[PDB]
């Protein structure tokens, strides 16, 4: 309607560093005029899949608020983002609700985030006591005891560090390169809309 401000999509897609999967950052988009053409302007998108709305009709809708979640994950796990899936990345790091509506985008990024012998500054959880409810973030890294015997101090026999590190090299085959993932979430038409495309009111 009255407002006219371009949304900061280029502040997310053209970002330099993406955080680790266990501590993904959520960015709120509001009070701007959306434009979903420059989003599709990039051709080599590995996956661009929308669940609730259809992508071709995203230019005439008003959203109550937009949320963007960005991270990097292995290729073999890129299919563990759709709702209702299970595994070791959708059970302990990032879970989506069953009635989720929005669009997910993912593309290969081996040209940037890889190192000559591996990158050890990307982490992911491997050990936890229970599955997490949707859209829940965990940061604590307490020593996780596995056996009946209580643990303390340092790790070791049956005492494991609940985190692990990746290793990205330009030598692995397809399925191990670091794939960058951005997920959009939004609700439709129940409140004064802050994000809207060009209108014909």
């Amino acid at each position: 309607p009255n407002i006219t401000n371009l949304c900061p999509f280029d502040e997310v897609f053209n970002a330099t560093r993406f955080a680790s999967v266990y501590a993904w950052n959520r960015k709120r988009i509001s009070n701007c005029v959306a434009d979903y053409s420059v989003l599709y302007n990039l051709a080599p998108f590995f996956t661009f899949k929308c669940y609730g709305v259809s992508p071709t009709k995203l230019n005439d809708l008003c959203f109550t608020n937009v949320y963007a979640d960005s991270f990097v994950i292995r290729g073999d796990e890129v299919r563990q983002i759709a709702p209702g899936q299970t595994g070791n990345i959708a059970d302990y790091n990032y879970k989506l609700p069953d009635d989720f509506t929005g669009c997910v985008i993912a593309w290969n990024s081996n040209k940037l985030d890889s190192k000559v012998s591996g990158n050890y500054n990307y982490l992911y959880r491997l050990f936890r006591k229970s599955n997490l409810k949707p859209f829940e973030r965990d940061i604590s890294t307490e020593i996780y005891q596995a056996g009946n015997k209580p643990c303390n101090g340092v790790a070791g026999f049956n005492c494991y560090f609940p985190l692990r590190s990746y290793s990205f090299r330009p030598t692995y085959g397809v399925g191990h390169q670091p794939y960058r993932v951005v997920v959009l979430s939004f609700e439709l038409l129940h409140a004064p809309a802050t994000v809207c495309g060009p209108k014909k009111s």
Partner: antibody
Amino acid sequence: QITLKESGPTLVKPTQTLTLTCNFSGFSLNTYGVGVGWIRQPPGKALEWLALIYWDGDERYGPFFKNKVTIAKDTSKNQVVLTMTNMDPVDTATYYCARHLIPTIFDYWGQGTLVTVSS
Amino acid sequence: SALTQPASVSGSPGQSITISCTGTSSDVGGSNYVSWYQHHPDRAPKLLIYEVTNRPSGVSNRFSGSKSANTASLTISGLQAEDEADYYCSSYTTTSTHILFGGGTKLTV
């Protein structure tokens, strides 16, 4: 303009430790992705890879000279420093400093300098 | 090293010639990011091939590349005296991040 330059000695004693420096003009090492590597070539044979340095303090040395070489950076002065020990007469070679990227292994090779080991 | 290259190949000017670089299935095999440089006598090396059949700006489209089961090959068409220099092949290896290719000096008649 993007230029690479090298600075160091020419006559090094076997007991001494070789030191060499490279200056780069046209970008900064702090940028996400760019690295700087060192290449030596002994006369009569091919070139060789010594070491490389990344933006966030990641170090990768040659598999056979882990305990002898050591490199460091100074982005406030746009310099990179290489130090090697236990000179031997076979180490006579021409040295180069070059840019490093993940897709393209080496892009901008410097002019380099020839160094010899003798009395 | 476990990586070699033929010593020298000479070809007549104005005719297509190809110089090949060889490796092993384990270290390089079917990897990617192969590269090819040329080194002139007393001049800094410059990049000519950085990806398979790919060249950066300042194109010299006559040069071409090819990758076979365990080798690579660069083809030059229309040779000149300027082409007379050393040619280095290059690739990633699993055991170490090195190239160490001997390089074959080009000759013209």
